Motif scaffolding. Structure first.
Motif, PDB file in Angstrom:
ATOM      1  N   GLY A 296       0.810  -1.252   0.129  1.00 11.69           N
ATOM      2  CA  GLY A 296       0.154  -0.001   0.088  1.00 11.69           C
ATOM      3  C   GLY A 296       0.832   1.266   0.004  1.00 11.69           C
ATOM      4  O   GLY A 296       0.428   2.464   0.597  1.00 11.69           O
ATOM      5  N   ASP A 470      -8.921   4.785   2.229  1.00 10.55           N
ATOM      6  CA  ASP A 470      -7.780   4.266   2.004  1.00 10.55           C
ATOM      7  C   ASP A 470      -6.879   5.243   0.886  1.00 10.55           C
ATOM      8  O   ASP A 470      -7.551   5.771   0.041  1.00 10.55           O
ATOM      9  CB  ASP A 470      -7.616   2.981   1.410  1.00 10.55           C
ATOM     10  CG  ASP A 470      -6.244   2.599   0.778  1.00 10.55           C
ATOM     11  OD1 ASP A 470      -5.152   2.685   1.514  1.00 10.55           O
ATOM     12  OD2 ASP A 470      -6.392   1.888  -0.086  1.00 10.55           O
ATOM     13  N   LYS A 471      -5.582   5.417   0.930  1.00 13.17           N
ATOM     14  CA  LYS A 471      -5.207   6.687   0.394  1.00 13.17           C
ATOM     15  C   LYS A 471      -4.646   6.037  -1.144  1.00 13.17           C
ATOM     16  O   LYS A 471      -5.125   6.598  -1.976  1.00 13.17           O
ATOM     17  CB  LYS A 471      -3.968   7.185   1.178  1.00 13.17           C
ATOM     18  CG  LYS A 471      -2.981   8.090   0.287  1.00 13.17           C
ATOM     19  CD  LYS A 471      -1.801   8.558   0.880  1.00 13.17           C
ATOM     20  CE  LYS A 471      -0.410   8.619  -0.130  1.00 13.17           C
ATOM     21  NZ  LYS A 471      -1.066   9.362  -1.434  1.00 13.17           N
ATOM     22  N   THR A 472      -3.759   5.257  -1.398  1.00 10.93           N
ATOM     23  CA  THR A 472      -3.071   4.768  -2.416  1.00 10.93           C
ATOM     24  C   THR A 472      -4.117   3.729  -3.247  1.00 10.93           C
ATOM     25  O   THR A 472      -4.626   2.814  -2.715  1.00 10.93           O
ATOM     26  CB  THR A 472      -1.740   4.139  -2.301  1.00 10.93           C
ATOM     27  OG1 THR A 472      -1.101   4.932  -1.280  1.00 10.93           O
ATOM     28  CG2 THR A 472      -1.289   3.957  -3.451  1.00 10.93           C
ATOM     29  N   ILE A 672      -7.206   5.847   6.721  1.00 10.52           N
ATOM     30  CA  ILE A 672      -6.177   5.041   7.054  1.00 10.52           C
ATOM     31  C   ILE A 672      -5.265   4.355   5.897  1.00 10.52           C
ATOM     32  O   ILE A 672      -5.856   3.763   5.265  1.00 10.52           O
ATOM     33  CB  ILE A 672      -7.155   3.677   7.671  1.00 10.52           C
ATOM     34  CG1 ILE A 672      -8.110   4.455   8.554  1.00 10.52           C
ATOM     35  CG2 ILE A 672      -6.175   2.791   8.313  1.00 10.52           C
ATOM     36  CD1 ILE A 672      -9.100   3.218   8.941  1.00 10.52           C
ATOM     37  N   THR A 673      -4.099   4.787   6.069  1.00  8.09           N
ATOM     38  CA  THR A 673      -3.253   4.609   4.904  1.00  8.09           C
ATOM     39  C   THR A 673      -2.148   3.804   5.227  1.00  8.09           C
ATOM     40  O   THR A 673      -2.015   3.363   6.428  1.00  8.09           O
ATOM     41  CB  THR A 673      -2.884   5.833   4.268  1.00  8.09           C
ATOM     42  OG1 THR A 673      -1.822   5.540   2.983  1.00  8.09           O
ATOM     43  CG2 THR A 673      -1.902   6.695   5.377  1.00  8.09           C
ATOM     44  N   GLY A 674      -1.126   3.462   4.393  1.00  4.38           N
ATOM     45  CA  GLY A 674       0.025   2.915   4.580  1.00  4.38           C
ATOM     46  C   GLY A 674       1.376   3.488   4.140  1.00  4.38           C
ATOM     47  O   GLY A 674       2.578   3.037   4.580  1.00  4.38           O
ATOM     48  N   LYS A 773      -5.699  -1.994  10.797  1.00  6.01           N
ATOM     49  CA  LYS A 773      -7.083  -1.849  10.280  1.00  6.01           C
ATOM     50  C   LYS A 773      -8.388  -2.366  10.855  1.00  6.01           C
ATOM     51  O   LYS A 773      -9.107  -1.821  11.038  1.00  6.01           O
ATOM     52  CB  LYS A 773      -7.212  -1.400   8.648  1.00  6.01           C
ATOM     53  CG  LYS A 773      -5.883  -0.925   8.167  1.00  6.01           C
ATOM     54  CD  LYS A 773      -6.021  -0.899   6.578  1.00  6.01           C
ATOM     55  CE  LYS A 773      -5.009  -0.215   6.034  1.00  6.01           C
ATOM     56  NZ  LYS A 773      -5.196   0.095   4.684  1.00  6.01           N
ATOM     57  N   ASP A 792      -9.236  -0.500  -2.098  1.00  3.22           N
ATOM     58  CA  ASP A 792      -9.226  -1.233  -3.247  1.00  3.22           C
ATOM     59  C   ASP A 792      -7.839  -2.284  -3.140  1.00  3.22           C
ATOM     60  O   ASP A 792      -7.814  -3.186  -3.804  1.00  3.22           O
ATOM     61  CB  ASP A 792      -8.834  -0.319  -4.485  1.00  3.22           C
ATOM     62  CG  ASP A 792      -7.343   0.067  -4.361  1.00  3.22           C
ATOM     63  OD1 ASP A 792      -6.636   0.365  -3.196  1.00  3.22           O
ATOM     64  OD2 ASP A 792      -6.811   0.269  -5.546  1.00  3.22           O
ATOM     65  N   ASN A 795      -4.412  -5.261   1.417  1.00  2.00           N
ATOM     66  CA  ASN A 795      -4.271  -5.319   2.921  1.00  2.00           C
ATOM     67  C   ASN A 795      -5.197  -4.814   3.733  1.00  2.00           C
ATOM     68  O   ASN A 795      -5.479  -5.033   5.014  1.00  2.00           O
ATOM     69  CB  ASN A 795      -2.997  -4.211   3.313  1.00  2.00           C
ATOM     70  CG  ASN A 795      -3.247  -2.879   2.590  1.00  2.00           C
ATOM     71  OD1 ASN A 795      -3.964  -2.943   1.461  1.00  2.00           O
ATOM     72  ND2 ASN A 795      -2.740  -1.983   3.182  1.00  2.00           N
ATOM     73  N   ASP A 796      -6.247  -4.078   3.178  1.00  2.00           N
ATOM     74  CA  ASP A 796      -7.515  -3.741   3.805  1.00  2.00           C
ATOM     75  C   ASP A 796      -8.632  -4.694   3.485  1.00  2.00           C
ATOM     76  O   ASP A 796      -9.662  -4.110   3.564  1.00  2.00           O
ATOM     77  CB  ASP A 796      -7.695  -2.249   3.220  1.00  2.00           C
ATOM     78  CG  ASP A 796      -7.909  -2.095   1.865  1.00  2.00           C
ATOM     79  OD1 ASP A 796      -7.566  -3.149   1.106  1.00  2.00           O
ATOM     80  OD2 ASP A 796      -8.043  -0.746   1.405  1.00  2.00           O
TER      81      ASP A 796
HETATM   82  F1  BEF Z   1      -3.001   2.883   1.117  1.00  2.00           F
HETATM   83 BE1  BEF Z   1      -4.277   1.883   1.107  1.00  2.00          BE
HETATM   84  F2  BEF Z   1      -3.934   0.963   2.360  1.00  2.00           F
HETATM   85  F3  BEF Z   1      -4.494   1.175   0.099  1.00  2.00           F
END
Ligand code: BEF
Ligand SMILES: [Mg+2]
Length: 1092
Positions: A296, A470-472, A672-674, A773, A792, A795-796
């Motif tokens: 991610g 989710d960010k990316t 909530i990102t990575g 998460k 998408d 990991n989530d």
């Molecule tokens: F950056 Be996300 F967790 F797809």
């Protein structure tokens, strides 16, 4: 006996199948049947009835619980060579118990007992007499020599295939019978079959069988729709593709399914809609993977070989040696062949060779997906509603029973009346109404390509309190794009300045094209880092077969010699030539180039630190004039600054507006990102999640000791913190700064007293693991809020499953989807494709489009669905109370209606009740949220007061009519319909009450469109109102005569009309009274937004 040994299992007992005679229910019953036959050879028939019922119940007792099933059908044994089933007692945190079948097969002269529980293989080991799952070599502590010295598989691997299985990802889908069994438990279905059985007890056969068939068909269609959705959208997109494999000392091309651990493969540049097969480890070569899907993050990582490390002493650590591992589910942008020769020949392609370590569901992605699928885990409103209806039906039944036994009727007719009350407690058109509502909601969602597999979660989207993101891949793209130059100036008028494109001086446009590693092949192609290709295209350079590149629009340029990019001292170089003279271009990291060139600019450090502290990944290039083959330190002796190169993933053009619309609608949206905290904070600030200054929780030093530190994006404030002594001072931290917690700070704060006070005031979580998460969403649900997740990646997946409503955004545009649909239609008559991935396997909703406004559309539909549910419940309650009173009281008097009156009234009111559902929501989102559940002061008070108004009206008019005509104390319930005055005086008011109970309660303005825009119900109510008001004042004598209505006097007509108007207006007024005084539609405490 057997004893499975695995962290999934807790206990296990064998099972042998018992015959059809030794079953527990069968042996005891024959004596009872013989006794019954002897006693028989009236009152005794109920005994045979209850005996057959108890026998059939004993038979169906096993199917509900697997423990009872294993206790009844199979008898435990203690010999593994004869049992054919085995019971598995799972651990508390891993799924549920079950029964798995012991298989057998003879290979190499020995039979191999084995089964497979929860996609985790088991085998029979005689030396320990335990079913043991396989343990891979990489898990055991390996010497790096064991990997370095391996030479692929050789011989016949007929045992490895059994021990490890095929590298295949096959997800099971539920069968139709279990899916129907899940639906056949619902209270409405069991109540419907119970009532149709009660009616069949005495009524006709044809009507009852037709009703039962019509009830079964609805469930059949619903389960078919859900099963089609599951069959389509429950799978991960995995298609085998040929690769080379070193088997029997020769490179032979196998598929992706036939891979085993410790097998040599040669991975090349991964094509589109493909990924790395399984968990590989580089044995020789190099690569540039993209972990955006699994891990991610945005930047492409650079992997290296394992050959240079010492062979004997060092151990394979997966610590310092993490630069050599390659997971499964990531794309490889570039690969380089091995440099020197080894004891095996180089691969036939240009790829790099690597070693397999794990295959199948035991890899990382496979483990995540399997734990999601198998290790998974209110109806009290419907139960209370049913109990309410039953209480009122029982009251009415008691009254009618007392009155019947007082009048002197037989018990059969009283039983028939008490059965009719409970049969008519609910309208017959409820199943069709529910099915129409569900299908309309689904077909309205599916026009934005939002396919749902669990339609009972659409009402959940009405009262959403927290919207996670989710960010990316969800809010931003996953590739780096060229943004433009920066820093090539000396005026210091503005730091953040981007010479977008083609505005560079001659030196920069020469250097951007001279310092690269791309090359054109003979058959026609270009290879190299895709970011290098992106910038070379954006500036407008064209590479030819010969290393000389030209056709840029100004002239030509050729390259003499180029250098490599080492992991250490990260930079590159090149020696080019022009028509004028010869120069040398250099492009590397900014900090290393800075010490190289002599003329240090003034804003170098400022621009570097301003563009690196917010997401972007800069690259500082430089050159040097070289007058007319040499070393490396001479060309990089001293340089001259020539410009930056800034790359960052771009936002989706729909994210800003969607987040603004969710913020202006009393929702709280978090991220909530990575990625690293800097990029996460930058994107969250640009989108509109955080507003003021932002603080970050991360480790203070480097080594250890769990000391967090509040640190600004810049180096302004450094508030120290200690998760062992200190505590969050709310008034000084949360009021002045919006804070963003990282993964390490969330890990070192476990068990703190104020962890929840922290989670209440943080909007951004960066660098969290796929297992945190789930913890965040579970804590947000345990606090009391309703959650949502829109991601998408892989990991989530657990977060998508655990949320109240999950959404999985795929890739695709409107034009591409429309073209694909048109092509499919044309093929049935006579842009890159979309990948189903692993996030669509767990999320109920799956937006086949890529934009983010799918969240807004889903919430907008959920509001309307919840409003429809509440209105239907309230109308059902009112109609049930009115029908119960009507029967119980009226029927005990001399009131019987004709046929045509009932027919027309039923037709019109059924049309209205079916048109209740159809309603289009408003395109705007409002701050007021719909009510959840009928049981509260507002709705209950409104219902009871409307019932009281109706009762008062009807009692007054009955007293008036009994004033007109005699009371007739003696009543008989067999006299047929006869035109009377009580008939009309009751029927007109029944019509007006049934009109009011719709016109007062239906209207909801803020959530869906007005009643006038619902043409069906509007026209129905207008027709019935016209009928009632033409019958009350006998405006049409022909119509009054045609419908069997007695002519009335004048004073009675005036009284009846005034009574109708007063009834309607009083009902509407008291409903509005309760609505104005006790609405209580409040947004959550976390949803309010204050200026920090
Ligand atoms: F950056 Be996300 F967790 F797809
Ligand atoms: Mg993602």
């Amino acid at each position: 006996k057997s004893f499975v040994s695995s962290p999934i299992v807790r206990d296990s007992t064998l099972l042998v199948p018992k015959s059809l005679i030794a079953k527990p229910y069968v042996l005891p019953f024959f004596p009872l049947y013989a006794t019954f036959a002897q006693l028989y050879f009236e009152w005794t028939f109920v005994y045979l009835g209850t005996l057959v019922s108890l026998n059939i119940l004993v038979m169906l007792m096993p199917a509900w619980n697997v423990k009872i099933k294993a206790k009844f059908n199979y008898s435990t044994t203690k010999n593994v060579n004869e049992a054919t089933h085995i019971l598995i007692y799972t651990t508390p945190n891993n799924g549920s118990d079950g029964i798995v079948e012991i298989q057998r097969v003879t290979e190499a002269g020995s039979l191999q007992t084995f089964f497979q529980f929860q996609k985790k293989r088991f085998l029979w080991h005689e030396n320990e007499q335990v079913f043991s799952s396989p343990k891979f070599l990489v898990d055991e502590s390996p010497k790096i020599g064991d990997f370095q010295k391996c030479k692929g598989h050789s011989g016949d691997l007929t045992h490895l295939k059994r021990l490890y299985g095929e590298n295949s990802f096959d997800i099971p889908i539920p069968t139709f019978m279990e899916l129907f069994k899940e639906h056949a438990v619902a209270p409405l279905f069991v109540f419907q079959v119970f009532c149709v059985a009660l009616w069949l007890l005495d009524e006709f056969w044809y009507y009852s069988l037709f009703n039962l068939f019509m009830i079964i068909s609805m469930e059949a269609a619903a389960v078919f729709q859900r099963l089609t959705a599951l069959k389509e959208f429950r799978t991960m997109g995995i298609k085998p593709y040929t690769i080379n494999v070193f088997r029997n000392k020769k490179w032979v091309a196998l598929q992706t399914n036939e891979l085993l651990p410790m097998d040599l493969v040669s991975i090349t540049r991964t094509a589109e809609e493909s990924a790395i097969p399984c968990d590989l480890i580089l044995l020789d070569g190099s690569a540039i993977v993209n972990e955006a899907m699994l891990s991610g993050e945005s930047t492409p990582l650079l992997k290296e070989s394992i050959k240079l490390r010492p062979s004997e002493d060092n151990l394979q650590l997966d610590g310092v040696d993490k630069i050599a591992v390659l997971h499964g589910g990531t794309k490889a942008l570039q690969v380089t062949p091995p440099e020197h020769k080894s004891d095996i020949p180089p691969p036939p392609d240009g790829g790099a060779l690597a070693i397999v370590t794990k295959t199948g569901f035991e890899t990382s992605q496979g483990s995540l997906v399997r734990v999601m699928i198998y290790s998974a885990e209110d109806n009290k409103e419907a139960l209370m509603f049913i109990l309410f209806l039953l209480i009122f039906a029982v009251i009415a039944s008691w009254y009618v029973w007392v009155e019947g036994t007082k009048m002197g009727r037989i018990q059969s007719k009283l039983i028939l009346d008490c059965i009719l009350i409970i049969t008519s407690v609910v309208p017959p058109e409820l199943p069709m109404e529910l099915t129409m509502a569900v299908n309309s909601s689904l077909a309205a969602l599916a026009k934005f390509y939002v396919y749902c597999t669990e339609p009972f979660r659409i009402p959940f989207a009405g009262r959403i309190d927290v919207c996670c993101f989710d960010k990316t891949g969800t809010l931003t793209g996953e590739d780096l794009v060229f943004e433009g130059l920066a820093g090539i100036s000396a005026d210091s008028e503005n730091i953040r300045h981007l010479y977008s494109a083609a505005e560079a001086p001659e030196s920069t446009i020469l250097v951007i094209g001279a310092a690269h590693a791309l090359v054109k092949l003979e058959d026609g192609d270009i290879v190299g880092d895709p970011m290098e290709k992106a910038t070379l295209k954006a500036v407008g350079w064209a590479v030819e077969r010969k290393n000389s590149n030209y056709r840029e629009g100004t002239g030509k340029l050729d390259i003499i010699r180029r250098f490599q990019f080492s992991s250490a001292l990260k930079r590159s170089a090149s020696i080019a030539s022009h028509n004028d003279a010869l120069f040398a271009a250099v492009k590397g990291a900014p900090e290393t180039i800075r010490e190289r060139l002599s003329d240090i600019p003034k804003n170098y450090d400022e621009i570097y630190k301003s563009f690196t502290r917010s997401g972007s990944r800069v690259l500082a290039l430089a050159s040097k004039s070289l007058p007319k083959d040499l070393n490396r330190d001479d060309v990089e002796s001293e340089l001259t600054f020539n410009g930056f190169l800034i790359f960052h993933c771009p936002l989706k053009d729909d994210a800003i507006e969607t987040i603004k619309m969710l913020n202006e609608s009393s929702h709280r949206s978090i991220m909530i990102t990575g990625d690293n905290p800097l990029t996460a904070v930058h994107v969250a600030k640009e989108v509109g999640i955080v507003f003021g200054e932002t603080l970050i929780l991360d480790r203070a030093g480097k080594s250890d000791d769990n000391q967090l530190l509040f640190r600004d994006v810049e180096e302004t404030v450094s508030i120290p913190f200690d998760p062992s002594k200190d505590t969050f001072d709310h008034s000084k931290l949360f009021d002045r700064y919006d804070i963003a917690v990282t993964g390490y700070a969330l890990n070192a704060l476990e068990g703190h007293s104020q962890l929840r006070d922290l989670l209440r005031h943080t909007w951004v979580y960066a660098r969290v693991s796929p297992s945190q998460k789930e913890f965040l969403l579970n804590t947000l649900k345990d606090m009391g809020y309703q959650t949502l997740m829109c991601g998408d990646g892989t990991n989530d997946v657990g977060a998508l499953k655990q949320a109240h409503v999950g959404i999985a955004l795929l890739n695709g545009t409107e034009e591409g989807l429309k073209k694909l649909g048109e092509q499919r239609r044309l093929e049935g008559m006579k842009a890159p494709a979309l990948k189903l991935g692993d996030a669509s396997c767990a999320a109920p909703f799956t937006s086949k489009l890529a934009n983010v406004s799918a969240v807004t559309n889903i919430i907008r539909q959920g509001r309307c669905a919840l409003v429809n549910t509440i209105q239907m419940y309230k109308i059902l309650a009112l109609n049930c109370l009115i029908s119960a009173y009507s029967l119980s009281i009226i029927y005990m008097a001399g009131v019987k209606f004709g046929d045509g009156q009932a027919t027309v009234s039923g037709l019109l009111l059924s049309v209205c009740f079916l048109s209740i559902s159809r309603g289009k929501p408003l395109e705007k989102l409002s701050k007021q949220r719909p009510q959840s559940g009928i049981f509260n002061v507002y709705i209950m008070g409104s219902i009871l007061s409307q019932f009281a108004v109706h009762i008062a009206t009807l009692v007054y008019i009955t007293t008036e009519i009994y004033k007109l005509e005699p009371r007739e104390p003696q009543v008989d319930l067999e006299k047929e319909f006869a035109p009377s005055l009580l008939n009309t005086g009751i029927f007109i008011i029944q019509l007006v009450q049934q009109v009011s109970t719709f016109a007062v309660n239906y209207q909801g303005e803020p959530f869906r469109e007005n009643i006038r825009s619902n043409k069906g119900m509007y026209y129905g109510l207008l027709g019935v109102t016209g009928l009632a008001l033409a019958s009350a004042t006998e405006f049409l004598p022909e119509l009054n005569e045609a419908m069997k209505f007695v002519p009335m006097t004048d004073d009675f007509k005036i009284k009846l009309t005034l009574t109708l108007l007063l009834d309607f207006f009083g009902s509407w007024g008291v409903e509005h009274f309760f609505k104005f005084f006790f609405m209580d539609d409040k947004p959550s405490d976390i949803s309010v937004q204050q200026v920090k």
